[PDB]
Amino acid sequence: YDDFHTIDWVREKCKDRERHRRINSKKKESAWEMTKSLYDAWSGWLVVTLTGLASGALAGLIDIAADWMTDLKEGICLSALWYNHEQCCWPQWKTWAELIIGQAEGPGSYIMNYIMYIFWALSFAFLAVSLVKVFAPYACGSGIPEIKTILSGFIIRGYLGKWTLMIKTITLVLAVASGLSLGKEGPLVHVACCCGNIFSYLFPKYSTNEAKKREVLSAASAAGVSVAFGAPIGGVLFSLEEVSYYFPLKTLWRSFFAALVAAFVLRSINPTPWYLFELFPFILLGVFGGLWGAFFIRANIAWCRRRKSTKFGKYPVLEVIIVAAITAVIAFPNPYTRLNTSELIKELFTDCGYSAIWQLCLALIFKIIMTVFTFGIKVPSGLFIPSMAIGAIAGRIVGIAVEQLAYYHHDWFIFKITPGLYAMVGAAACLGGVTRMTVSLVVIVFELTGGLEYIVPLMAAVMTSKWVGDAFGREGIYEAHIRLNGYPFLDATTLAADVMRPRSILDMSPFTVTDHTPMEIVVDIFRKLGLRQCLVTHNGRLLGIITKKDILRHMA
Amino acid sequence: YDDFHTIDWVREKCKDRERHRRINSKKKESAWEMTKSLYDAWSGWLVVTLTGLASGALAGLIDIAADWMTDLKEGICLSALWYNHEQCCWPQWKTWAELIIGQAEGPGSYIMNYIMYIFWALSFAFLAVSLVKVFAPYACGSGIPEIKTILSGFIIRGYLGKWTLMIKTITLVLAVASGLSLGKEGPLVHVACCCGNIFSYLFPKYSTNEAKKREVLSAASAAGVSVAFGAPIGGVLFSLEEVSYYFPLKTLWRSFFAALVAAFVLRSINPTPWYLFELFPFILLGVFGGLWGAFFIRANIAWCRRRKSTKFGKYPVLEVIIVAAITAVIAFPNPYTRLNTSELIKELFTDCGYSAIWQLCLALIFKIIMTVFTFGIKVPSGLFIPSMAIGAIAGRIVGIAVEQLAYYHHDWFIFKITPGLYAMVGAAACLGGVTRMTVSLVVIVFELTGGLEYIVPLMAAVMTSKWVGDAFGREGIYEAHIRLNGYPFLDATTLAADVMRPRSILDMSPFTVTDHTPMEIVVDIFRKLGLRQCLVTHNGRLLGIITKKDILRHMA
Numbered sequence A, B: 001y002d003d004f005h006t007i008d009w010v011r012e013k014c015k016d017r018e019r020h021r022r023i024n025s026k027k028k029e030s031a032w033e034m035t036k037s038l039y040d041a042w043s044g045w046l047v048v049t050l051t052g053l054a055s056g057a058l059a060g061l062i063d064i065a066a067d068w069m070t071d072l073k074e075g076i077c078l079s080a081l082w083y084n085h086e087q088c089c090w091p092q093w094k095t096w097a098e099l100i101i102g103q104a105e106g107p108g109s110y111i112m113n114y115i116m117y118i119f120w121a122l123s124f125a126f127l128a129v130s131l132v133k134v135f136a137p138y139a140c141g142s143g144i145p146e147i148k149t150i151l152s153g154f155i156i157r158g159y160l161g162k163w164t165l166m167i168k169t170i171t172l173v174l175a176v177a178s179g180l181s182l183g184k185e186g187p188l189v190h191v192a193c194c195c196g197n198i199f200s201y202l203f204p205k206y207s208t209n210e211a212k213k214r215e216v217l218s219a220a221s222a223a224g225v226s227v228a229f230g231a232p233i234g235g236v237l238f239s240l241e242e243v244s245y246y247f248p249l250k251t252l253w254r255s256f257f258a259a260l261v262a263a264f265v266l267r268s269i270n271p272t273p274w275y276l277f278e279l280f281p282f283i284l285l286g287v288f289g290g291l292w293g294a295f296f297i298r299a300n301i302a303w304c305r306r307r308k309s310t311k312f313g314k315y316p317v318l319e320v321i322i323v324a325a326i327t328a329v330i331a332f333p334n335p336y337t338r339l340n341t342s343e344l345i346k347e348l349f350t351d352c353g354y355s356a357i358w359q360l361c362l363a364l365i366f367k368i369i370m371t372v373f374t375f376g377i378k379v380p381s382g383l384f385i386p387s388m389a390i391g392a393i394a395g396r397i398v399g400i401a402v403e404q405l406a407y408y409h410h411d412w413f414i415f416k417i418t419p420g421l422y423a424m425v426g427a428a429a430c431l432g433g434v435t436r437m438t439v440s441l442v443v444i445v446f447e448l449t450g451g452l453e454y455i456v457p458l459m460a461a462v463m464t465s466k467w468v469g470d471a472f473g474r475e476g477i478y479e480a481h482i483r484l485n486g487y488p489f490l491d492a493t494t495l496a497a498d499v500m501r502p503r504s505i506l507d508m509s510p511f512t513v514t515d516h517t518p519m520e521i522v523v524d525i526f527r528k529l530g531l532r533q534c535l536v537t538h539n540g541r542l543l544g545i546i547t548k549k550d551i552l553r554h555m556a
C-alpha cells in the first residue's frame, strides 16, 4: 500500500495465517522452535506491556514538565530552580516582579507580572508551533480522529512515528505550559499509539503485517486513555467505544493489561451523599454539556473548515502566536483563567473547608471562546481537559447557585450539597457531549475518584448530554473531524449498480457481489470483512468494481 | 427454519433493516410514531431489564428453596416449619432421630438419621428426574453448551421455553437438595436465557427476528452468570468470553445492565496479606485445577458418550435414582460431604477463629468421582459449584499442609498464612481448568469477595490451570459437550473444492466464492458473516454449494 491508502483486511489475515503455517511447520521439530513460538505469543504480550510502560512514563514526564513550566510562567522559586510554585512551599517563592522590581504589590509590580505572563505564554506557544511545523507537522491537533481512521485500515505513514512522538511530547508540554485552552490527555492517546507503533516494529509478527499492528494500536489507545485519566477500565472502554471497532475477544484483555500497566507506572512517577432533588440540577448540567458539544462541534469545525479556505492555512505560526497572545492577555487578570486548567479542575472539584460567581462566569465564557478558536491550531491541542474545565466551571456555578437558593429559601418543601459534585457532573456532561461517549466516560469518572455514590448523577448527566448533543448531529468531534479531512473511514434503498464504477501476484480470491444485491449488504460486507475492492458481476461477467472510495463518495 | 437448523445471519440482518425502514417511514409523521420509535429502543432496554429482574428473583427463590430442602434432609425445626437448620437458631432444632426415636445420640439415633438422609436424597433426586423426563427433557444438564450453539445461530425450539424454565427451576431446587454433586449456577445461565427468550416474545422487535433475540440471549447469559456468582462484571465477561462471539458494542452495555439488575435483585431477596513464597502453592493448585479439568473433560465425556452407546440411554430415571442413592449413602457419614456443597464452600473459604485432612481428602475423592458420574444425568446438573468445591477442598488441604510444614519447620529460610485464601485459589483454579476461562473467572472471584490483594494468586492459579488443561485438549467442557452432541457450532491447506457438495422468495443475493478460494477464507466468511449456504462457482458457473454442515463435516 502507498501512503493514504486503506488496507485490504482479508489479505492481512491471509498473510498472518501463512506466517502461522510457516512457524508451526518447524515449531515441533526442536525445542528452540517451541521456544520461538512461545516467544511470539509473549512478543505480542511484551508489545502491549512496553506500550503501557512507555505511555505511563511519557504521561508522567509530560505532567511534571507541564506543571513546572506552567508555574514558571509567573515566578521562580530561588531556593531550587526545579520546583514549581506548589512544590518548594512543601519568601521561598519570588514572582518576576520582586525578582526585578523588588517589590510585591503595587501598580508597577502588577504590570510587570502581567507583561511577564504574556511574554512567557507567547514564547511557549511560539516554540510549540515552531517545533511542530518545522520537525513533525503530524504532531498537531488531538490526534484521535486519524487514530480511529488508522485502526480502520488507513495508512498515514509518519503519523505514529519517532518524530511525531518526540515533537508531540515536547510541544504538548510547551502548549500546555503556554496557557492555551488545550490539554495533554487526547494527545496522550496519540502518544500512546505512537509508542504502540514504534514498538510494533521491534518484533516480526507486527512489523511485517498491518492487521496485527492495528491490534497493538487498539491496546495502545487503551493505555493512552488510562494515563490520560488514570482509569485503566476507563481506558479499555474508551478504546472499545471510540477508537476502534475490531475486538476479537483478545484486544480487550491486552487493552486491559496495557491500561493497568500504564496507570501503575504513571502512579510510580512522582519525583458526601447527594439528595434526590439534585438530579434536576445534574440533568441540567447534562443538557448544557450536550449543547456545548453540539455548539463546539459545529463552531470548531466551521473554524477548521475555514482555516482550509482562507489565508490561515498558509499562516500556522502567526495563528498560534496570535491565539497564544490573546489567551495570555485575557487570561491573566482573572485568577481562575490564570491557573493551569488542570489546577482549575482540581480547585473546582474540591469542597471548601458573589465575586466567585462573576469570575467563574468570566472563566467559562473565555474558555468556551478560546477552545473553539484553539482546537485545531498547529500545536498538540487536546480536547479532554478544556471540555472538562468548561463543564466543571458550569457545574460549580450551578452548585453555588443551588447553595444560595437553598440558604435563602430553605423553607421550600424541596430541601426540608457539595459543589464539588456539581463540578464533577458538569465536567462529565461536557466531556461526553462533545466526544459523544456514554459509559466509557462515566467509568473513567468513577475511577477518577472511586466513589460509587456518584454513578447516578454522572450517568444521568452524561446520557442527557449525549441525547441533547445528538439532536444537532450524530457524529462526534473525533469523527466529525474525519468527515472534514475526508479520510476513508467506514462508519460502523440502493443496489450495487448505483455505487459501481464505471457508471504469482494475481489475486485469485476476489470477493464478488451480484449487481442485484442491496447496497446495504455490500456496505456490511466491507465493514465486517474490511475489503478494499470487490468485483460486481452480472451472471458471472466481469462487469464493474466497487472500492471503499466509491462507497464513501456515495455516502458523501 | 425448521427445528435443529442453523440460521442465515445475513437474512436476519436484512429483515431487521426492513423493519427499521418500515418504522422510520412513519416515524416522523405523528408524535405517536416517534413515541413508538423511542418505545422500540426502550423495548430492547426493558427486555434486558425484565430478564435481569426475573433472573435475580429466580436465583433468589432457588437459593432459598434449595437451602430449606437441603436442611430438611436431616431434621426439622418444630418451632417454624419454614426455617432451615441455620435459620431457626438465629432444643429448637430436632433431627429426625429425636423426632421419632426420641433420643439424640446412640447407635439407633445414628442409624435412623442415616436412613432418613438416604431416603430424602433418593426422594428428591427421584422427583427431579421424574419431573424433567415427564414434562421438560430440555431441563437436564448444565445447559450452557446448547446456549452457546443457540447464540451461534442454532434453533432448538423448546430449549428456552416456559416448560423448560419451570421444570429446570423446580428440578434444580430438588437436585440441589438431593445431595447430588451438582449446582444451580450454570443452570442459572440457562434459566436466565430462558427468561431472555420468554421475554423476547413480549415485544415485536425480537419475537419476529432471530438475530435480535440472540442479542437478548447474550444479555440474559450475562445476567445469569451475575446471579450465579453475584458478580455483575464477572457475568458480563462470562457472556463475552464463553457464551457468545457476537458483541456489536451494544450487547456489552446491555449485558452490564442485565448483570447489575440481576445481582441487585438477588441481594434484595433474602427473607490478610499473602506472602510471596505462597505462589508456589498457589501455582500448584492451578496445576491441579488444570489436571482436574483435563481429567474431567475426558472422563465425563466418555461417560456421556457411553450413556449414548449402552442401556443407560433408555434408563434415565433408574440412573438418577442409583446415582442419588450412592451419593447419599457415601456422603452422610463424612461431616463435610453431608453439608450442602455451597455450605462446604462457605466453610472452606473462611478462616478459623489430623482428622481434618483425612476427612477433607475423603470429601475430595468422593466429589471427584461423583461429579464425573453426575454431570450429565437427567437432572439440572450444573458444573460451577462442584468444581469450586473440589478446588476448595484441594486448596484447603494444601493450606493446612502449609500450616503444618511452617509450624514444624519455621526455621526454614523461606518463612522467616490464611487457608481460606488457598481455598479461594483452588476453587478458581479448578473452575477455570474445566471451563477453560481465564479472566472472566478471575474477575468473578475478585467480585465474589472484593479484595484486590488476591488478584495475583487467583490470576496465577487460573492461568496455570488453563495452560495445564489445554495440554490435554483445547476445547472446554461446554464445547466438548457440543462436539459430543454434534451441534452445528462453528468454532471461533484446502480449497472450496475439497469441502463442496457434490463431490418473491428467490434469494437474489447468494454469496459465491470461487473454487480457487482458500478454504480458510470461506470459513472466515461464514464465521464473521454467519452465512448458512454459499454457492461456489467456476468462472461464474453454478457448480457446487457449501453449507455449515459441509464445513463441520470437514472438521469432523
Ligand SMILES: [Cl-]
Binding pocket: A140, A141, A142, A143, A144, A145, A146, A481
Ligand atoms: Cl486531529
Ligand SMILES: [Cl-]
Binding pocket: A182, A183, A184, A185, A186, A187, A382, A383, A384, A385, A386
Ligand atoms: Cl486532554
Ligand SMILES: [Cl-]
Binding pocket: A142, A143, A144, A185, A186, A187, A381, A382, A383, A384
Ligand atoms: Cl483529544
Ligand SMILES: [Cl-]
Binding pocket: B140, B141, B142, B143, B144, B145, B146, B481
Ligand atoms: Cl448440557
Ligand SMILES: [Cl-]
Binding pocket: B182, B183, B184, B185, B186, B187, B382, B383, B384, B385, B386
Ligand atoms: Cl453451579
Ligand SMILES: [Cl-]
Binding pocket: B142, B143, B144, B185, B186, B187, B381, B382, B383, B384
Ligand atoms: Cl454449568
